[PDB]
Amino acid sequence: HCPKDWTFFQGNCYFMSNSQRNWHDSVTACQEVRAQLVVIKTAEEQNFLQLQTSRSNRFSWMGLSDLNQEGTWQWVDGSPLSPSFQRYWNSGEPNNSGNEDCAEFSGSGWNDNRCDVDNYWICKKPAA
Amino acid sequence: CRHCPKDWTFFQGNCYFMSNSQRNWHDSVTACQEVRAQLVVIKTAEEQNFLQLQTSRSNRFSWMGLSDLNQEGTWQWVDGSPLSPSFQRYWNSGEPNNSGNEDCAEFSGSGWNDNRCDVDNYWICKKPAA
Ligand SMILES: CC(=O)N[C@H]1[C@H](O[C@@H]2[C@@H](OC[C@H]3O[C@H](O)[C@@H](O)[C@@H](O[C@H]4O[C@H](CO)[C@@H](O)[C@H](O)[C@@H]4O[C@@H]4O[C@H](CO)[C@@H](O)[C@H](O)[C@H]4NC(C)=O)[C@@H]3O)O[C@H](CO)[C@@H](O)[C@@H]2O)O[C@H](CO)[C@@H](O)[C@@H]1O
Ligand SMILES: [Ca+2]
Ligand SMILES: [Ca+2]
Ligand SMILES: [Ca+2]
């Protein structure tokens, strides 16, 4: 069971924003609704999110970043990016932007983009 | 830097928007996000005074970004800060009474009242002045 306007998928609820904001404000926006900028835990979830993103032609932020530009990607839950997910980057990605780097769903895979760019976002929280 | 969008009011470096439509608390939170704002999180007594005057003169019940949804009795602002002991004085007499389970805060008369989150109320957004 999920709140109205939230999507249920494999035990979790996902909120697809209908507006755009920078990565930081997106992290904040999800906490406002007792959720978290989506942290992908399984390949099934990734396929699901990538699909929703591509069908709506909307570049969307996920809770993954390398704010120090040290090439060290971490999820907002504190966990690191497993090498198993490195395959989700689009061709040539991730290419540092020269500024704080954040991950976005773009077409078929993920892109590295500047964190202050305005993108749609996706929040996630357990179903009830 | 005291510039605000049309229909928004300025006070101490921030812009406030009072809605003309009504939505439940949850939808109000997301409504403010759509306009690059946040359901009002009150940080100072002075701000509370400014807002209570605006709301009482409009004669409307309006949502603020405060709730005790996570833990009944412990109020939290949507920005992650807890309701301070000093701000508890703003609840109207006899409130919060959790009548039929009320976990969202609204401006009501001269102070605040907890109401059911699924109730349609006007709302107030806040964002930095530019
Ligand atoms: C006279 C005046 O100042 N008018 C102002 C007005 O002031 C407010 C107004 O409130 C009138 C009622 O408005 C709504 O109906 C409710 O907010 C109601 O409160 C009860 O119901 C809500 C749920 O709908 C509860 O959240 C609330 O706690 C309260 O519940 C009742 O609580 C008692 C005590 O525990 C309990 O015994 C009852 O069973 C319970 N009832 C229910 C339904 O649960 C308001 O009473 O007038 C009040 C004067 O007495 C003021 O105190 C209010 O602030 O504000 C507007 C806005 O500016 C202004 O235009 C108007 O002139
Ligand atoms: Ca409750
Ligand atoms: Ca309550
Ligand atoms: Ca009440």
Short mmCIF file of N, CA, C and O in Angstrom, two decimals, chain A:
data_model
loop_
_atom_site.label_atom_id
_atom_site.label_comp_id
_atom_site.label_asym_id
_atom_site.label_seq_id
_atom_site.Cartn_x
_atom_site.Cartn_y
_atom_site.Cartn_z
N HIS A 1 0.83 -1.24 0.00
CA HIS A 1 0.00 0.00 0.00
C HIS A 1 0.85 1.27 0.00
O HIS A 1 1.75 1.42 0.82
N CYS A 2 0.54 2.18 -0.92
CA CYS A 2 1.27 3.44 -1.04
C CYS A 2 0.31 4.63 -1.05
O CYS A 2 -0.85 4.50 -1.42
N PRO A 3 0.80 5.81 -0.64
CA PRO A 3 -0.04 7.01 -0.61
C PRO A 3 -0.48 7.34 -2.03
O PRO A 3 0.10 6.83 -3.00
N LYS A 4 -1.51 8.17 -2.17
CA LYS A 4 -1.96 8.54 -3.50
C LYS A 4 -0.81 9.25 -4.20
O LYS A 4 -0.07 10.02 -3.57
N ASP A 5 -0.66 8.98 -5.49
CA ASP A 5 0.40 9.59 -6.30
C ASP A 5 1.77 8.93 -6.14
O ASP A 5 2.75 9.37 -6.74
N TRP A 6 1.84 7.87 -5.33
CA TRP A 6 3.08 7.14 -5.15
C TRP A 6 2.91 5.78 -5.85
O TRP A 6 1.81 5.23 -5.90
N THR A 7 4.01 5.25 -6.37
CA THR A 7 3.97 3.98 -7.08
C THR A 7 4.51 2.82 -6.27
O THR A 7 5.58 2.92 -5.66
N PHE A 8 3.79 1.71 -6.29
CA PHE A 8 4.22 0.52 -5.56
C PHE A 8 5.03 -0.39 -6.46
O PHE A 8 4.63 -0.67 -7.59
N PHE A 9 6.17 -0.85 -5.96
CA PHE A 9 7.03 -1.77 -6.70
C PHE A 9 7.90 -2.58 -5.75
O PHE A 9 8.74 -2.03 -5.04
N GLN A 10 7.69 -3.89 -5.76
CA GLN A 10 8.45 -4.82 -4.93
C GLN A 10 8.62 -4.40 -3.47
O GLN A 10 9.74 -4.34 -2.96
N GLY A 11 7.50 -4.11 -2.81
CA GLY A 11 7.53 -3.73 -1.41
C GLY A 11 7.86 -2.29 -1.06
O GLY A 11 7.86 -1.93 0.11
N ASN A 12 8.14 -1.46 -2.06
CA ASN A 12 8.48 -0.06 -1.80
C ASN A 12 7.57 0.92 -2.54
O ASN A 12 6.87 0.55 -3.50
N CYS A 13 7.56 2.17 -2.09
CA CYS A 13 6.76 3.20 -2.73
C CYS A 13 7.69 4.23 -3.35
O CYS A 13 8.68 4.64 -2.73
N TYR A 14 7.38 4.63 -4.57
CA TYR A 14 8.20 5.60 -5.28
C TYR A 14 7.41 6.83 -5.68
O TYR A 14 6.29 6.74 -6.18
N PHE A 15 8.01 7.99 -5.44
CA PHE A 15 7.40 9.26 -5.78
C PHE A 15 8.14 9.87 -6.96
O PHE A 15 9.34 10.14 -6.87
N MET A 16 7.42 10.06 -8.06
CA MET A 16 7.97 10.67 -9.27
C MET A 16 7.55 12.13 -9.26
O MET A 16 6.37 12.43 -9.46
N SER A 17 8.49 13.02 -9.01
CA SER A 17 8.19 14.45 -8.95
C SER A 17 7.64 14.93 -10.28
O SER A 17 7.87 14.31 -11.32
N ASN A 18 6.93 16.05 -10.24
CA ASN A 18 6.37 16.63 -11.45
C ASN A 18 6.97 18.01 -11.69
O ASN A 18 6.41 18.83 -12.42
N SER A 19 8.11 18.25 -11.05
CA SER A 19 8.83 19.52 -11.20
C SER A 19 10.32 19.21 -11.08
O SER A 19 10.70 18.09 -10.75
N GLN A 20 11.16 20.21 -11.35
CA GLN A 20 12.62 20.04 -11.31
C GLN A 20 13.36 20.91 -10.29
O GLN A 20 12.98 22.06 -10.06
N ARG A 21 14.40 20.34 -9.69
CA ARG A 21 15.23 21.03 -8.69
C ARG A 21 16.65 20.45 -8.72
O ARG A 21 16.88 19.40 -9.32
N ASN A 22 17.60 21.13 -8.09
CA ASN A 22 18.97 20.63 -8.08
C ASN A 22 19.05 19.40 -7.17
O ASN A 22 18.14 19.14 -6.39
N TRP A 23 20.14 18.65 -7.26
CA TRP A 23 20.30 17.43 -6.48
C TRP A 23 20.13 17.60 -4.97
O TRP A 23 19.45 16.80 -4.32
N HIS A 24 20.75 18.62 -4.40
CA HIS A 24 20.67 18.86 -2.97
C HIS A 24 19.23 19.06 -2.50
O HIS A 24 18.78 18.45 -1.53
N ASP A 25 18.52 19.94 -3.19
CA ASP A 25 17.13 20.23 -2.85
C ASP A 25 16.25 19.00 -3.07
O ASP A 25 15.19 18.88 -2.45
N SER A 26 16.68 18.10 -3.95
CA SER A 26 15.91 16.88 -4.19
C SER A 26 16.08 15.95 -3.00
O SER A 26 15.13 15.30 -2.57
N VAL A 27 17.29 15.89 -2.46
CA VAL A 27 17.55 15.06 -1.29
C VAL A 27 16.66 15.58 -0.16
O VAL A 27 16.04 14.80 0.57
N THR A 28 16.60 16.90 -0.03
CA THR A 28 15.78 17.56 0.99
C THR A 28 14.30 17.29 0.78
O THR A 28 13.57 16.97 1.72
N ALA A 29 13.85 17.43 -0.47
CA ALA A 29 12.46 17.22 -0.81
C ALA A 29 11.98 15.84 -0.40
O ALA A 29 10.87 15.68 0.11
N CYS A 30 12.81 14.82 -0.61
CA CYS A 30 12.40 13.48 -0.22
C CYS A 30 12.30 13.30 1.29
O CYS A 30 11.40 12.62 1.78
N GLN A 31 13.21 13.94 2.03
CA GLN A 31 13.17 13.84 3.49
C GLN A 31 11.92 14.52 4.03
O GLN A 31 11.38 14.12 5.06
N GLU A 32 11.46 15.55 3.32
CA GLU A 32 10.26 16.27 3.73
C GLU A 32 9.06 15.32 3.77
O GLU A 32 8.20 15.44 4.64
N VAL A 33 9.02 14.39 2.82
CA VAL A 33 7.91 13.43 2.77
C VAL A 33 8.28 12.08 3.39
O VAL A 33 7.77 11.03 2.98
N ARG A 34 9.17 12.12 4.38
CA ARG A 34 9.61 10.92 5.10
C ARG A 34 10.15 9.82 4.20
O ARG A 34 9.93 8.64 4.45
N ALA A 35 10.86 10.22 3.14
CA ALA A 35 11.43 9.27 2.19
C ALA A 35 12.90 9.59 1.94
O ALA A 35 13.52 10.36 2.67
N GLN A 36 13.45 9.01 0.88
CA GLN A 36 14.86 9.22 0.56
C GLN A 36 15.08 9.25 -0.95
O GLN A 36 14.44 8.48 -1.68
N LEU A 37 15.95 10.14 -1.43
CA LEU A 37 16.24 10.21 -2.87
C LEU A 37 16.66 8.79 -3.17
O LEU A 37 17.62 8.29 -2.59
N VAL A 38 15.94 8.15 -4.09
CA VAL A 38 16.16 6.75 -4.41
C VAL A 38 17.56 6.15 -4.43
O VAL A 38 18.44 6.56 -5.19
N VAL A 39 17.75 5.15 -3.58
CA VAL A 39 18.98 4.39 -3.47
C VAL A 39 18.63 3.04 -4.08
O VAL A 39 17.79 2.31 -3.54
N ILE A 40 19.25 2.70 -5.21
CA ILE A 40 18.96 1.45 -5.89
C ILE A 40 19.66 0.25 -5.26
O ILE A 40 20.89 0.21 -5.19
N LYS A 41 18.87 -0.73 -4.83
CA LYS A 41 19.41 -1.92 -4.19
C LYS A 41 19.51 -3.17 -5.07
O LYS A 41 20.33 -4.05 -4.81
N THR A 42 18.67 -3.27 -6.10
CA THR A 42 18.71 -4.44 -6.98
C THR A 42 18.61 -4.10 -8.46
O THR A 42 18.16 -3.01 -8.83
N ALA A 43 19.03 -5.04 -9.29
CA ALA A 43 18.99 -4.85 -10.73
C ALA A 43 17.55 -4.69 -11.21
O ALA A 43 17.29 -3.94 -12.16
N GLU A 44 16.62 -5.37 -10.55
CA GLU A 44 15.21 -5.30 -10.91
C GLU A 44 14.68 -3.89 -10.71
O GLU A 44 13.92 -3.37 -11.54
N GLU A 45 15.09 -3.26 -9.61
CA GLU A 45 14.66 -1.91 -9.28
C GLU A 45 15.23 -0.93 -10.30
O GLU A 45 14.53 -0.02 -10.77
N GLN A 46 16.49 -1.12 -10.65
CA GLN A 46 17.15 -0.28 -11.64
C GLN A 46 16.39 -0.34 -12.96
O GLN A 46 16.04 0.70 -13.53
N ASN A 47 16.12 -1.55 -13.43
CA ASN A 47 15.40 -1.72 -14.68
C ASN A 47 14.06 -1.00 -14.60
O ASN A 47 13.65 -0.33 -15.55
N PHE A 48 13.40 -1.12 -13.46
CA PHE A 48 12.11 -0.48 -13.24
C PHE A 48 12.22 1.04 -13.33
O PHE A 48 11.50 1.69 -14.10
N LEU A 49 13.14 1.61 -12.55
CA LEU A 49 13.34 3.06 -12.55
C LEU A 49 13.79 3.58 -13.92
O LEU A 49 13.26 4.58 -14.41
N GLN A 50 14.75 2.90 -14.54
CA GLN A 50 15.24 3.32 -15.84
C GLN A 50 14.09 3.39 -16.83
O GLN A 50 13.99 4.32 -17.64
N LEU A 51 13.20 2.41 -16.75
CA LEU A 51 12.04 2.33 -17.63
C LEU A 51 11.06 3.50 -17.43
O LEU A 51 10.62 4.13 -18.40
N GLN A 52 10.73 3.78 -16.18
CA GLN A 52 9.81 4.87 -15.86
C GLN A 52 10.38 6.18 -16.37
O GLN A 52 9.66 7.02 -16.92
N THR A 53 11.69 6.34 -16.19
CA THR A 53 12.39 7.54 -16.61
C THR A 53 12.39 7.74 -18.12
O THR A 53 12.08 8.83 -18.61
N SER A 54 12.73 6.69 -18.86
CA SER A 54 12.77 6.78 -20.31
C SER A 54 11.40 7.02 -20.94
O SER A 54 11.28 7.81 -21.88
N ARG A 55 10.37 6.36 -20.43
CA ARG A 55 9.03 6.53 -20.98
C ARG A 55 8.45 7.92 -20.78
O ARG A 55 7.60 8.36 -21.56
N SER A 56 8.90 8.63 -19.74
CA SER A 56 8.38 9.97 -19.49
C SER A 56 9.30 11.05 -20.05
O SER A 56 9.06 12.24 -19.86
N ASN A 57 10.36 10.63 -20.74
CA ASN A 57 11.32 11.57 -21.32
C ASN A 57 11.77 12.60 -20.29
O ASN A 57 11.83 13.79 -20.58
N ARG A 58 12.08 12.13 -19.08
CA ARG A 58 12.51 13.03 -18.02
C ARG A 58 13.80 12.59 -17.35
O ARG A 58 13.90 11.47 -16.84
N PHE A 59 14.80 13.47 -17.36
CA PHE A 59 16.08 13.20 -16.74
C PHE A 59 15.78 13.34 -15.25
O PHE A 59 15.25 14.37 -14.82
N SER A 60 16.11 12.32 -14.47
CA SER A 60 15.82 12.37 -13.04
C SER A 60 16.99 12.00 -12.15
O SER A 60 17.79 11.12 -12.48
N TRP A 61 17.09 12.68 -11.01
CA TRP A 61 18.15 12.43 -10.03
C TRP A 61 17.88 11.17 -9.22
O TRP A 61 16.73 10.82 -8.97
N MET A 62 18.96 10.51 -8.81
CA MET A 62 18.90 9.34 -7.95
C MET A 62 19.81 9.74 -6.79
O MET A 62 20.59 10.69 -6.93
N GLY A 63 19.72 9.04 -5.67
CA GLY A 63 20.53 9.37 -4.51
C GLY A 63 21.96 8.87 -4.55
O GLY A 63 22.42 8.20 -3.62
N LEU A 64 22.67 9.22 -5.62
CA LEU A 64 24.06 8.80 -5.81
C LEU A 64 24.90 10.01 -6.18
O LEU A 64 24.49 10.80 -7.02
N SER A 65 26.08 10.15 -5.57
CA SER A 65 26.92 11.30 -5.87
C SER A 65 28.40 11.15 -5.53
O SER A 65 28.81 10.24 -4.81
N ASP A 66 29.18 12.09 -6.07
CA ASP A 66 30.62 12.19 -5.85
C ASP A 66 30.86 13.69 -5.68
O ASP A 66 31.45 14.35 -6.54
N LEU A 67 30.36 14.23 -4.57
CA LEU A 67 30.47 15.66 -4.28
C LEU A 67 31.88 16.22 -4.17
O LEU A 67 32.09 17.41 -4.39
N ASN A 68 32.85 15.38 -3.82
CA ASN A 68 34.23 15.85 -3.69
C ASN A 68 34.98 15.76 -5.01
O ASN A 68 36.12 16.21 -5.12
N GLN A 69 34.33 15.17 -6.01
CA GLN A 69 34.93 15.00 -7.33
C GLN A 69 36.16 14.09 -7.23
O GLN A 69 37.05 14.13 -8.08
N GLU A 70 36.18 13.26 -6.19
CA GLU A 70 37.29 12.33 -5.97
C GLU A 70 37.05 11.02 -6.72
O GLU A 70 37.80 10.06 -6.56
N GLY A 71 35.99 10.98 -7.53
CA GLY A 71 35.68 9.78 -8.28
C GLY A 71 35.18 8.67 -7.38
O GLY A 71 35.26 7.49 -7.73
N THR A 72 34.68 9.04 -6.21
CA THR A 72 34.17 8.08 -5.24
C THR A 72 32.66 8.26 -5.10
O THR A 72 32.20 9.12 -4.36
N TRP A 73 31.90 7.43 -5.80
CA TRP A 73 30.44 7.52 -5.77
C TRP A 73 29.82 6.82 -4.57
O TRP A 73 30.12 5.67 -4.27
N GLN A 74 28.94 7.54 -3.88
CA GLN A 74 28.27 7.03 -2.69
C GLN A 74 26.78 7.34 -2.71
O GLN A 74 26.35 8.37 -3.24
N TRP A 75 25.99 6.44 -2.13
CA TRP A 75 24.55 6.64 -2.07
C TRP A 75 24.27 7.49 -0.84
O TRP A 75 25.10 7.59 0.06
N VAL A 76 23.09 8.10 -0.79
CA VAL A 76 22.72 8.96 0.33
C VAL A 76 22.51 8.20 1.63
O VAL A 76 22.45 8.80 2.70
N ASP A 77 22.41 6.87 1.55
CA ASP A 77 22.22 6.07 2.76
C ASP A 77 23.57 5.76 3.39
O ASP A 77 23.65 5.08 4.41
N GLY A 78 24.63 6.25 2.76
CA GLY A 78 25.97 6.03 3.27
C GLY A 78 26.73 4.88 2.63
O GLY A 78 27.94 4.75 2.83
N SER A 79 26.03 4.06 1.86
CA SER A 79 26.67 2.92 1.21
C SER A 79 27.36 3.33 -0.08
O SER A 79 26.93 4.26 -0.75
N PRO A 80 28.45 2.63 -0.43
CA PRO A 80 29.20 2.93 -1.66
C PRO A 80 28.54 2.28 -2.87
O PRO A 80 27.65 1.44 -2.73
N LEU A 81 28.99 2.67 -4.06
CA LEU A 81 28.45 2.12 -5.30
C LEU A 81 29.18 0.83 -5.66
O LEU A 81 30.36 0.85 -6.02
N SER A 82 28.48 -0.29 -5.57
CA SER A 82 29.07 -1.59 -5.88
C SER A 82 29.47 -1.69 -7.35
O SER A 82 28.78 -1.19 -8.23
N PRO A 83 30.61 -2.35 -7.62
CA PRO A 83 31.12 -2.53 -8.99
C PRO A 83 30.11 -3.23 -9.88
O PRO A 83 30.19 -3.17 -11.11
N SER A 84 29.14 -3.89 -9.25
CA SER A 84 28.11 -4.60 -9.98
C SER A 84 27.19 -3.63 -10.72
O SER A 84 26.56 -4.00 -11.71
N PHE A 85 27.13 -2.39 -10.24
CA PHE A 85 26.28 -1.38 -10.85
C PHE A 85 27.00 -0.46 -11.84
O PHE A 85 26.36 0.36 -12.50
N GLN A 86 28.31 -0.60 -11.93
CA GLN A 86 29.10 0.23 -12.84
C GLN A 86 28.64 0.09 -14.29
O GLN A 86 28.93 0.95 -15.12
N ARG A 87 27.93 -0.99 -14.59
CA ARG A 87 27.47 -1.23 -15.94
C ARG A 87 26.28 -0.37 -16.36
O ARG A 87 25.95 -0.28 -17.54
N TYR A 88 25.64 0.27 -15.39
CA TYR A 88 24.48 1.11 -15.68
C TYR A 88 24.81 2.49 -16.24
O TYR A 88 23.92 3.19 -16.72
N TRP A 89 26.08 2.87 -16.20
CA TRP A 89 26.48 4.17 -16.73
C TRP A 89 26.33 4.16 -18.25
O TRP A 89 26.55 3.13 -18.89
N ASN A 90 25.95 5.29 -18.83
CA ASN A 90 25.81 5.36 -20.27
C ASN A 90 27.22 5.31 -20.86
O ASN A 90 28.20 5.34 -20.12
N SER A 91 27.30 5.23 -22.18
CA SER A 91 28.60 5.18 -22.85
C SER A 91 29.43 6.42 -22.55
O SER A 91 28.99 7.55 -22.77
N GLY A 92 30.64 6.21 -22.04
CA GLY A 92 31.51 7.33 -21.73
C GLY A 92 31.37 7.86 -20.32
O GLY A 92 32.21 8.64 -19.86
N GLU A 93 30.32 7.44 -19.63
CA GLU A 93 30.08 7.88 -18.26
C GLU A 93 30.77 6.94 -17.28
O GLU A 93 31.03 5.78 -17.59
N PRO A 94 31.05 7.43 -16.06
CA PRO A 94 30.74 8.80 -15.65
C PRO A 94 31.89 9.76 -15.92
O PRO A 94 33.03 9.50 -15.53
N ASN A 95 31.60 10.86 -16.60
CA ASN A 95 32.64 11.84 -16.88
C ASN A 95 32.45 13.07 -16.00
O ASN A 95 31.45 13.78 -16.11
N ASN A 96 33.41 13.31 -15.11
CA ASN A 96 33.37 14.44 -14.20
C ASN A 96 33.02 15.73 -14.93
O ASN A 96 33.51 16.00 -16.03
N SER A 97 32.17 16.53 -14.30
CA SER A 97 31.69 17.78 -14.88
C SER A 97 32.59 18.98 -14.60
O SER A 97 32.51 19.99 -15.28
N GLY A 98 33.45 18.86 -13.59
CA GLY A 98 34.31 19.97 -13.24
C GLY A 98 33.74 20.68 -12.02
O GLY A 98 34.32 21.63 -11.49
N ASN A 99 32.57 20.20 -11.58
CA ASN A 99 31.87 20.72 -10.41
C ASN A 99 31.41 19.52 -9.60
O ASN A 99 31.75 18.38 -9.93
N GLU A 100 30.64 19.77 -8.55
CA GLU A 100 30.09 18.68 -7.74
C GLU A 100 29.41 17.76 -8.74
O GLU A 100 28.68 18.23 -9.61
N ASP A 101 29.64 16.45 -8.63
CA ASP A 101 29.04 15.50 -9.54
C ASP A 101 27.92 14.68 -8.91
O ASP A 101 28.04 14.20 -7.77
N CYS A 102 26.84 14.52 -9.66
CA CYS A 102 25.67 13.78 -9.20
C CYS A 102 25.17 12.88 -10.33
O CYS A 102 25.37 13.19 -11.51
N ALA A 103 24.51 11.78 -9.98
CA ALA A 103 24.01 10.85 -10.99
C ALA A 103 22.55 11.06 -11.37
O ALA A 103 21.70 11.29 -10.51
N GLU A 104 22.26 10.97 -12.66
CA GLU A 104 20.90 11.15 -13.17
C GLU A 104 20.53 10.02 -14.12
O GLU A 104 21.39 9.48 -14.81
N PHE A 105 19.25 9.67 -14.15
CA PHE A 105 18.77 8.66 -15.09
C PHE A 105 18.65 9.41 -16.40
O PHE A 105 18.01 10.46 -16.46
N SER A 106 19.25 8.89 -17.46
CA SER A 106 19.17 9.55 -18.75
C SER A 106 19.05 8.53 -19.88
O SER A 106 20.02 7.88 -20.26
N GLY A 107 17.84 8.41 -20.41
CA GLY A 107 17.61 7.47 -21.49
C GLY A 107 17.70 6.02 -21.05
O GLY A 107 16.84 5.52 -20.33
N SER A 108 18.76 5.35 -21.49
CA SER A 108 18.97 3.94 -21.19
C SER A 108 19.82 3.65 -19.95
O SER A 108 19.76 2.55 -19.39
N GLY A 109 20.62 4.62 -19.52
CA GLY A 109 21.46 4.40 -18.36
C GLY A 109 21.64 5.64 -17.51
O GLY A 109 20.77 6.51 -17.48
N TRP A 110 22.78 5.72 -16.82
CA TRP A 110 23.06 6.86 -15.95
C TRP A 110 24.10 7.81 -16.52
O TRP A 110 25.02 7.39 -17.23
N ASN A 111 23.96 9.08 -16.18
CA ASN A 111 24.91 10.11 -16.61
C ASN A 111 25.46 10.82 -15.39
O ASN A 111 24.86 10.80 -14.31
N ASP A 112 26.62 11.45 -15.57
CA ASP A 112 27.23 12.23 -14.52
C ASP A 112 26.84 13.65 -14.88
O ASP A 112 27.08 14.08 -16.01
N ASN A 113 26.22 14.38 -13.96
CA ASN A 113 25.86 15.75 -14.26
C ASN A 113 26.14 16.62 -13.04
O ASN A 113 26.27 16.11 -11.93
N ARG A 114 26.26 17.92 -13.26
CA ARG A 114 26.52 18.85 -12.17
C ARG A 114 25.33 18.84 -11.22
O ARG A 114 24.18 18.94 -11.65
N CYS A 115 25.61 18.72 -9.93
CA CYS A 115 24.57 18.66 -8.92
C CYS A 115 23.59 19.84 -8.87
O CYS A 115 22.45 19.68 -8.42
N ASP A 116 24.00 21.01 -9.34
CA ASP A 116 23.09 22.16 -9.29
C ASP A 116 22.16 22.27 -10.50
O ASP A 116 21.42 23.25 -10.63
N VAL A 117 22.19 21.27 -11.37
CA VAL A 117 21.31 21.26 -12.54
C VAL A 117 19.91 20.92 -12.05
O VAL A 117 19.75 20.21 -11.06
N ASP A 118 18.89 21.43 -12.74
CA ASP A 118 17.51 21.13 -12.38
C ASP A 118 17.05 19.87 -13.10
O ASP A 118 17.04 19.83 -14.33
N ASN A 119 16.69 18.85 -12.33
CA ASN A 119 16.19 17.60 -12.88
C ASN A 119 14.99 17.20 -12.05
O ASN A 119 14.77 17.73 -10.96
N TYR A 120 14.20 16.26 -12.57
CA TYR A 120 13.07 15.74 -11.82
C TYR A 120 13.75 14.82 -10.82
O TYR A 120 14.96 14.61 -10.90
N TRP A 121 13.00 14.27 -9.87
CA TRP A 121 13.63 13.37 -8.91
C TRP A 121 12.68 12.26 -8.50
O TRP A 121 11.48 12.32 -8.78
N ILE A 122 13.22 11.23 -7.86
CA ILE A 122 12.42 10.09 -7.42
C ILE A 122 12.69 9.78 -5.95
O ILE A 122 13.84 9.61 -5.57
N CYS A 123 11.64 9.74 -5.14
CA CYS A 123 11.79 9.42 -3.72
C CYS A 123 11.34 7.98 -3.51
O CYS A 123 10.52 7.45 -4.27
N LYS A 124 11.87 7.35 -2.45
CA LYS A 124 11.54 5.97 -2.13
C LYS A 124 11.38 5.74 -0.63
O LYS A 124 12.14 6.29 0.17
N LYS A 125 10.39 4.94 -0.26
CA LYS A 125 10.14 4.57 1.13
C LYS A 125 9.35 3.27 1.17
O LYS A 125 8.64 2.94 0.22
N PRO A 126 9.46 2.50 2.27
CA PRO A 126 8.74 1.23 2.41
C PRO A 126 7.23 1.38 2.30
O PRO A 126 6.68 2.43 2.63
N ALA A 127 6.57 0.34 1.81
CA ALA A 127 5.12 0.36 1.69
C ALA A 127 4.54 0.16 3.08
O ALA A 127 5.25 -0.28 3.99
N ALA A 128 3.26 0.47 3.26
CA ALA A 128 2.61 0.31 4.56
C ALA A 128 1.27 -0.39 4.42
O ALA A 128 0.37 -0.08 5.23
#
